[PDB]
Design a protein around this nucleic acid. Structure first.
Ligand SMILES: Nc1ncnc2c1ncn2[C@@H]1O[C@H](COP(=O)(O)OP(=O)(O)OP(=O)(O)O)[C@@H](O)[C@H]1O
Ligand SMILES: [Mg+2]
Ligand SMILES: [Mg+2]
Ligand SMILES: [Mg+2]
Ligand SMILES: [Mg+2]
Ligand SMILES: [Mg+2]
Ligand SMILES: [Mg+2]
Ligand SMILES: [Mg+2]
Ligand code: NA
Lengths: 152, 79, 177, 66, 114
RNA sequence: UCCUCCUAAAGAGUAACGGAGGAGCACGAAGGUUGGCUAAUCCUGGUCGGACAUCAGGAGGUUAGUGCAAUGGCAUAAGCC
RNA sequence: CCAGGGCUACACACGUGCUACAAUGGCGCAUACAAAGAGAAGCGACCUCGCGAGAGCAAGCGGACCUCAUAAAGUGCGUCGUAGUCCGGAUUGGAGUCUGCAACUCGACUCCAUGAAGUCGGAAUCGCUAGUAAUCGUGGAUCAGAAUGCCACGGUGAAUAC
C-alpha cells in the first residue's frame, strides 16, 4: 500500500472556472451544447459516460491542450492545475531515468531528499531510481504521475 | 508636540545650570524636575533625574536635545 | 589588451624608477587571476552547483572546473569526492580583460562602496578579495539568478613582497584607501 | 580553448551615464549603458558628504525662535 | 511599467500604481499625477514611455524604497542606543506610544504564547 | 581449519588453558598496457565559512595512501587520474 | 503641608463593547428628509489665513429669533470586476495644533509615510415578538483638555411564533 497524500501550497476561496459555453464538436454534431457551470471551489464532479462521449476532449479544452470553438473558460489567477492525462506516453520519453524525471519537477526542493523519498514512500527502491523511467509499465507510470502531482 | 513657542523648562533648573556651566564639568546636578526639555547649553553636564525614589545620573550627548529630563529615567522596573 | 599595453608602456618605467631596479624583468608582474566559490550547499542538491558553474561561466568567459573535497570531515558532513566548489583560472589576454572589466566598472557597482582594503595581502605579493554579490557584474542581470552567492578574486603576481604587490596594483589605479 | 565548451565571447560597446564609451570584450550578446565607471565614481568627491550623518543641537536653535 | 523599485502592476489606474512604491501613499501619488500633468483615471498600459521618464524624475525627488529603509531603521537605532524610554520599548518589544499592555498589545507581542 | 606480530635465545624451526589482532571475502574492473601526477599536517590572505568544506602563497617532506587485521614493502612508485 | 512617582506596571486567564473580514461594498462628484438638547471666567456666526487639526479679527445670544449645527444611511452619475484587494486599520517614523504652570512616564486631534491580524470563526453561549430586532447618525450629564462608556433623540426598518 503506497502512502500518497496530495497537499495544497495555496488555498483557493471563491471559485475555479465559471465556464459558460464551449460549442465544441470535433467533426459531427457537438456532443454537448451549452455546458454553463461553476464550482465555487466545489469538489469531485465525476463526469461519466460511454466509450465515446467526450469527457477527455472536454477536459483537454478545459485545461488548455485544446480550446473551445467559441466561448471562454478562464481559471482563477492564483490557481495551480495538476493533470493526470488520459494518455501518458508523451511525458515518458527522451531517455530520462526515474530520479531525473521526478527531479525535473519541484519548486524549491533538495535534489537528494523530497525527490528521493517521495519515490520511496510509493513502492520504489534504490535499484528503481536508476533504471530509465521509459521502461516502466502501467501502475508504475501511474504512481509516477501521482508523485508528480504530490510534488507540484 | 507641545505648542508653537516657548520650550518650557523651570527657572530653578536654568539658574542652577548657568552657574554649573560657568565653572565647568563638576559634581552631578541634583534636581527633582522631569518636565523640562534639554536646551543646547546643557551638554557636558551630569544632571541627575528623580525617578520616584532616587536620582539616576545622566550624561547629555549630542542626540539628547528633543526630549525632557524624564525621558531617560525608567520610572518602574521589570523582572 | 588595453591594460596590458598600459602596463608595458607606463607601469614598467614607473616601478623601475620608484624601486631602483637593475633588470627590466625584476619588475613585479601579475601572472594569473583565480575566481572561485565553494557553494557548500551542494550536499543535498547538485543542481545548485550547476547554477553556480553557469554563474561563473557568465562572469568570466571560460568553463568553471568543479572541485571536490580533498578529505572527508564530519563538521559539515562531507566525504571525499563530493563536488563542493567551482574555480576558474585566467592567464594572459582574458586575465587582462577581466582585470579591466573589474576595476573600471564592476568595483563601483558594489552597494555601499568605500574602497578595497589594502592590508589584504598574503605577505608574498599576492592579493585576495571577496565580492559578496554576484550581481555587480554586468553579465548578470538580476533576473536569471536566484541567490546572492559571492565570488573570491585571487590575484597571483610575481611580486616578491606585499609592498611590491601594493605598488604594482596601485599603479593600475586600484581602489585602495 | 577547447572547441566550443565555453560561452560565446564577442566585442561589445558599453557606455556610461555621461558617455565615456569603452570597448570591452564580454559575454552578454548585447551592449549595455550603465552608471558612472571608475572614472566618474564619487568615492573621491562626496566622501565628506558620505560621512556627514548627524546633527540635532543646531536643529534645536532654529526651532528656538525666541 | 517601471519606477524606482518596480512598477510591476499593470491593469491598475495611474494614481494607484505608484502606491506600490515603498514611500508613496495616495495623496503623495495624487501630487505626482496632477503636478506632472497626467489624468488620475488613466490605465498604465495606455500611457507612453516618454511620460514615465517625466514620472521617474518627479518621484525621485522624494525619499523612497531605496533610501526610506535607512531613514526609519537608523532613527530607531538611535533611540535603541540612546537610552531613551521610547528606545527601551523598542528594545523589549512593547508598544511605544503609551497604550495598554495589560491584556491587549498582541500586535507588538506577536502571536499569543503561554 | 587458515592469516599477522611477540615469547623465538641476530639462518630455518621451536611449546603452554602464554600476550595482542583477523578470515570463510571483494573486483569485468579494484586486472593488462600506454601517457601523466604526487601526500598528511600546519602558518598568512579570502562572502556567507564555523576549530577544520572551496581558492592563492609558503613550510614540511610521505608522519599521507594501500578494497579488509598486522608485519615487511612501495617515488622507477605497488598510491592518484 | 509639599516635590517627584504609582493606580496607565504584563509570560497569562476571563467579562462587557468597538472596528472588520467587503460588491444589498468602498472611493469621487451633486442634491434632499429629522428629533432632542446645551450655552455667561460660556456658545460663538460672518471674514481672512492654514492642505487639516486650528490662528487673527470678531456681530449676535444669559435665548421658539443668535450659536453649537453641514444630520448619516438615501438618491443620481462614474470607477473599482474578486484580490489580503481602491476592504481592514493596527503598529511605527517625521513634521504639527490646542488645552493646562507642565503633554517623558500619561491627553486629544490633524498632515505625510508604513500598512499587520482578519477571507464569517471549536465545544459552548447571548438579545429580541412591531415601529420590536437589525442598521445609521445627533445631543447631553461629568469636564481646562480627556470616552468605542452611560444617559437620551430621531431616520430606515424586517422574519417567525404549528
Ligand atoms: N480525436 C477524436 N476523433 C473523433 N472523435 C473523438 C476524438 N476525441 C474524442 N472523440 C469523441 O469524443 C467522445 C468523448 O471523448 P472521450 O475520449 O473522453 O470519450 P470516452 O470514451 O467517454 O473516454 P475515455 O475512453 O477516454 O475514457 C468520444 O466518445 C469520441 O466519440
Ligand atoms: Mg629466528
Ligand atoms: Mg637462533
Ligand atoms: Mg624441537
Ligand atoms: Mg589494485
Ligand atoms: Mg606508468
Ligand atoms: Mg596497478
Ligand atoms: Mg484603575
Ligand atoms: Na475521457
Amino acid at each position: 500500500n503506497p502512502f500518497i497524500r496530495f497537499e495544497q501550497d495555496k488555498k483557493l476561496f471563491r471559485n475555479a472556472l465559471e465556464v459558460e459555453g464551449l460549442t465544441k464538436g470535433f467533426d459531427n454534431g457537438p456532443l454537448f451544447k451549452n455546458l454553463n457551470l461553476l464550482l465555487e471551489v466545489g469538489e469531485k464532479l465525476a463526469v461519466l459516460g460511454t466509450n465515446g462521449v467526450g469527457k477527455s476532449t472536454l477536459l483537454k479544452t478545459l485545461v488548455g491542450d485544446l480550446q473551445p470553438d467559441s466561448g471562454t473558460v478562464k481559471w482563477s489567477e492564483n490557481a495551480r492545475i495538476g493533470y493526470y492525462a488520459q494518455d501518458h506516453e508523451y511525458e515518458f520519453e527522451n531517455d530520462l531515468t526515474v530520479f531525473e524525471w521526478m527531479s525535473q519537477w519541484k519548486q524549491e526542493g533538495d535534489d537528494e531528499q523530497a525527490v528521493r523519498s517521495i519515490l520511496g514512500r510509493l513502492l520504489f527502491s534504490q535499484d528503481d531510481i536508476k533504471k530509465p523511467a521509459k521502461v516502466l509499465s502501467g501502475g508504475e507510470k501511474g504512481r509516477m504521475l501521482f508523485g508528480k502531482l504530490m510534488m507540484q | 508636540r507641545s505648542l508653537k513657542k516657548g520650550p518650557f523648562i523651570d527657572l530653578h533648573l536654568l539658574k542652577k545650570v548657568e552657574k554649573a556651566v560657568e565653572s565647568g564639568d563638576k559634581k552631578p546636578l541634583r534636581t527633582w524636575s522631569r518636565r523640562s526639555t534639554i536646551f543646547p547649553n546643557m551638554i557636558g553636564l551630569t544632571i541627575a533625574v528623580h525617578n520616584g525614589r532616587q536620582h539616576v545620573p545622566v550624561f547629555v550627548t549630542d542626540e539628547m536635545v528633543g526630549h525632557k529630563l524624564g525621558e531617560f529615567a525608567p520610572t518602574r522596573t521589570y523582572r | 589588451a588595453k591594460l596590458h599595453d598600459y602596463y608595458k608602456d607606463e607601469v614598467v618605467k614607473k616601478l623601475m624608477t620608484e624601486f631602483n631596479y637593475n633588470s627590466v624583468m625584476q619588475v613585479p608582474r601579475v601572472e594569473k587571476i583565480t575566481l572561485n566559490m565553494g557553494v557548500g550547499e551542494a550536499i543535498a542538491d547538485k543542481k545548485l552547483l550547476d547554477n553556480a558553474a553557469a554563474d561563473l561561466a557568465a562572469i568570466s568567459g571560460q568553463k568553471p572546473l568543479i572541485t571536490k573535497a580533498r578529505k572527508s570531515v564530519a563538521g559539515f558532513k562531507i566525504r571525499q569526492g563530493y563536488p563542493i566548489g567551482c574555480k576558474v583560472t585566467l592567464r594572459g589576454e582574458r586575465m587582462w580583460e577581466f582585470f579591466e572589466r573589474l576595476i573600471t566598472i564592476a568595483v563601483p557597482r558594489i552597494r555601499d562602496f568605500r574602497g578595497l582594503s589594502a592590508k589584504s595581502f598574503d605577505g608574498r605579493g599576492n592579493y585576495s578579495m571577496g565580492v559578496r554579490e554576484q550581481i555587480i557584474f554586468p553579465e548578470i542581470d538580476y533576473d536569471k539568478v536566484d541567490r546572492v552567492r559571492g565570488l573570491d578574486i585571487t590575484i597571483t603576481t610575481t611580486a616578491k613582497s606585499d609592498e611590491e604587490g601594493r605598488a604594482l596594483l596601485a599603479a593600475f589605479d586600484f581602489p585602495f584607501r | 580553448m577547447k572547441k566550443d565548451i565555453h560561452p560565446k565571447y564577442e566585442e561589445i560597446t558599453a557606455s556610461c551615464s555621461c558617455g565615456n564609451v569603452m570597448k570591452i570584450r564580454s559575454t552578454v550578446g548585447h551592449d549595455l549603458n550603465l552608471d558612472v565607471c571608475s572614472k566618474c565614481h564619487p568615492f573621491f568627491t562626496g566622501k565628506q558628504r558620505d560621512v556627514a550623518t548627524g546633527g540635532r543641537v543646531d536643529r534645536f536653535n532654529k526651532r528656538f525662535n525666541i | 511599467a517601471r519606477i524606482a523599485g518596480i512598477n510591476i502592476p499593470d491593469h491598475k489606474h495611474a494614481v494607484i500604481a505608484l502606491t506600490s512604491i515603498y514611500g508613496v501613499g495616495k495623496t503623495r501619488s495624487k501630487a505626482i499625477l496632477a503636478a506632472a500633468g497626467i489624468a488620475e483615471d488613466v490605465k498604465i498600459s495606455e500611457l507612453s514611455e516618454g511620460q514615465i521618464d517625466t514620472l521617474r524624475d518627479e518621484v525621485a525627488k522624494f525619499v523612497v524604497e531605496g533610501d526610506l529603509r535607512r531613514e526609519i531603521s537608523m532613527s530607531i537605532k538611535r533611540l535603541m542606543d540612546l537610552g531613551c524610554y521610547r528606545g527601551l520599548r523598542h528594545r523589549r518589544g512593547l508598544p511605544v506610544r503609551g497604550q495598554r499592555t495589560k491584556t491587549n498589545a498582541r500586535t507588538r507581542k506577536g502571536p499569543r504564547k503561554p
